Write a protein that binds this ligand. Structure first.
Ligand SMILES: O=Cc1ccc(Oc2nc3ncccc3s2)cc1
Ligand SMILES: [Yb+3]
Ligand SMILES: [Yb+3]
Ligand SMILES: [Zn+2]
Length: 607
């Protein structure tokens, strides 16, 4: 049972295909069109079915060429409104019909962000992008908005002729719109069954450059060159990922660099990964996000969580594959460094919610919980830590990678639960069941807080970060003179980030220590978004007023939640910047991503 969806479950009827025909109206901020769903009955004598909708205007429902009766239920908060449709003829089990729905989206759709010319790089054209994960596909079209249903799709998108439409699918052509010469129709085909949260659309003044034999990087003209260099390791990562997970079934692996308000680091949309421009560090240092997005082509896209309570299956396995890719490219000592950093990030997540909080559980109960509110580092890191613990318990990376490949093969094109994963783990490791019976499963899967066991980590690359961090924490006024730019000479960008994360865990530090850290290390000059973020957090939490304009700027110039949310919270918790944070939020709210605006408002407790 999927508690986040109001649609008929997979045991009643299953959507097999979507044929989407729509037009993007920028003056009205609406998507208008038809969604023809091929639905297969799973029951005898089926006479009605329910679909998920969220702020959609329904014009009509057509079956067999005639209008049918439908009814829209009362809105159920973040879940939206149920749409019950009365079928004209009762269906037998396995019978397939085509239901065509005429719909229109709301300009306030929580799936979309409509950007004015001023909000883009070019300044001449508007832009539109979607983000359906977890449950925002219902805010675009009527569907069974659950990952337990996998469908194929085709689409025809009418857009102003000067603009380009792209989807999480293979490009199948473009023609002038016959009903309007100022418009262009873009055609798309997704022939691999996908859960509907993987449906994605972007409309804008987009340009592309080839960077690999199966990869184009897409972005506005101004970011093309930087993005092509930033993501040049894409193909080498795909090759490694194919070696670990088996064949790449999606044909194309394109990348799209979104405008700065993109709410996440990346989004694993089939054929076209969406990424934040905050990755454009200039040295490929933030490429682990591409490795994560690539890994999802197996773990998440092929093997999917049946419900949002099992989201850790998608994330945990993706982080595990991500760290193997980076370990193949940069060495095992580097995989351990990233694994160790991940544990640190889990420690922070558990502290923020509290060690008893239900969102610190690996397997959650999302009954009456908005998935956007539950979202955190927990499924990623507690999920990673479990797998890394099993890897060490079961005989190392080579043995565990064998399980992972077999896991993807066993569950490809299917939606699964934790019990399914656990059952196959025991089946796969039958000769090591006694070892598996030592795992405290109830604590690992169902308990809040830090895991009952911490894996073993190589410390080589972490040691210098720890030593530097401890020098700064234990320093007194008379020790500040000993610090010099030479302290950093042998530290990588990654190690510098880890020095800051280590220091930030013991924040606040005395104001004089932070003024000195700027004087000798000039952290204000670093443009790398991960470093800059942690450095500004450390300045604000340590009460440095000079950092207020800098943190406010970073929180509003980009909108990646990982950065925007803790910056606003830090600025709101600092007395000197509290009122500024509140006013800035209020002034930017209307031009923010709807989900970001929602969550920041909750974190700030603003009306
Ligand atoms: O990337 C965007 C996104 C992805 C998933 C999502 O929903 C969930 N987040 C969780 N965190 C913990 C446990 C379960 C869940 S379900 C919301 C937004
Ligand atoms: Yb074709
Ligand atoms: Yb001293
Ligand atoms: Zn992910």
């Amino acid at each position: 049972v999927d508690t986040c969806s109001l649609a008929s479950p997979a045991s009643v009827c299953r959507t097999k295909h979507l044929h989407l025909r729509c037009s993007v109206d920028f003056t009205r901020r609406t998507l208008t069109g038809t969604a023809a769903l091929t639905v297969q009955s799973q029951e005898d004598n089926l006479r009605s079915l329910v679909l998920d909708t969220k702020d959609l205007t329904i014009e009509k429902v057509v079956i067999n060429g005639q209008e049918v009766k439908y009814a829209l239920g009362e809105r159920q908060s973040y879940k939206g409104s149920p749409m019950e449709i009365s079928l004209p003829i009762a269906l037998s089990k396995n019978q397939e019909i085509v239901i065509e729905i005429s719909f229109e989206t709301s300009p306030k759709s929580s799936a979309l962000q409509w950007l004015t010319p001023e909000q883009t790089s070019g300044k001449e054209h508007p832009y539109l992008f979607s983000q359906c994960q977890a449950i925002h596909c219902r805010a675009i079209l009527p569907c069974q908005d659950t990952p337990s249903v996998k469908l194929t799709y085709t689409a025809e998108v009418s857009v102003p002729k000067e603009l380009v439409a792209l989807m999480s699918a293979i490009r199948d052509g473009e023609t002038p719109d016959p009903e309007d010469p100022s418009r262009k129709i873009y055609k798309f085909i997704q022939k691999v069954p996908i859960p509907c949260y993987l449906i994605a659309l972007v409309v804008g003044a987009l340009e592309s450059r080839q960077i690999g034999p199966r990869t184009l990087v897409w972005s506005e003209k101004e970011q093309v060159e930087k993005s092509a260099y930033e993501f040049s390791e894409t193909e080498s990562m795909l090759k490694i990922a194919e070696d670990l997970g088996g064949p790449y079934v999606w044909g194309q692996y394109d990348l799209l660099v979104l405008p700065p308000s993109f709410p996440y680091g990346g989004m694993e949309n089939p054929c076209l990964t969406f990424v934040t421009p905050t990755l454009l560090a200039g040295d490929k240092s933030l490429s682990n996000v591409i490795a994560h997005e690539i890994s999802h082509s197996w773990t998440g896209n092929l093997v999917t969580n049946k419900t949002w309570d099992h989201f850790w299956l998608n994330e945990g396995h993706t982080v595990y594959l991500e760290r193997h890719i980076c370990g193949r490219l940069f060495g095992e000592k580097f995989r351990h460094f990233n694994a160790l950093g991940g544990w640190g990030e889990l420690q922070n997540s558990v502290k923020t919610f509290g060690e008893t909080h239900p969102f610190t559980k690996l397997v959650v109960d999302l009954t009456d919980i908005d998935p956007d509110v539950a979202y955190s580092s927990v499924p990623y890191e507690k999920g990673f830590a479990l797998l890394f613990y099993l890897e060490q318990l079961l005989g190392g990376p080579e043995i565990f990678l064998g399980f992972l490949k077999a896991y993807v093969e066993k569950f490809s094109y299917k939606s699964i639960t934790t019990d399914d994963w656990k059952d196959f783990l025991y089946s796969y490791f039958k000769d090591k069941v006694d070892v598996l019976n030592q795992v405290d499963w109830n604590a690992w899967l169902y308990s809040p807080g830090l895991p009952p066991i911490k894996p073993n980590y190589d410390m080589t690359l972490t040691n210098a970060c720890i030593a530097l961090s401890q020098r700064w924490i234990t320093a007194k006024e008379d020790d500040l003179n000993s610090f010099n730019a030479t302290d950093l000479k042998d530290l990588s960008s990654h190690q510098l980030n880890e020095f800051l994360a280590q220091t930030l865990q013991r924040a606040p530090l005395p104001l004089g220590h932070i003024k000195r850290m700027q004087e000798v290390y000039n952290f204000n000059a670093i443009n790398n978004s991960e470093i800059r973020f942690r450095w500004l957090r450390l300045c604000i939490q340590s009460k440095w007023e000079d950092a207020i304009p800098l943190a406010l700027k970073m929180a509003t110039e980009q909108g990646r939640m990982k950065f925007t949310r803790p910056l606003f919270k830090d600025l709101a918790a600092f007395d000197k910047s509290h009122d500024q944070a509140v006013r800035t939020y209020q002034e930017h709210k209307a031009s923010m991503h709807p989900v970001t605006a929602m969550l920041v408002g909750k974190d700030l407790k603003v009306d």
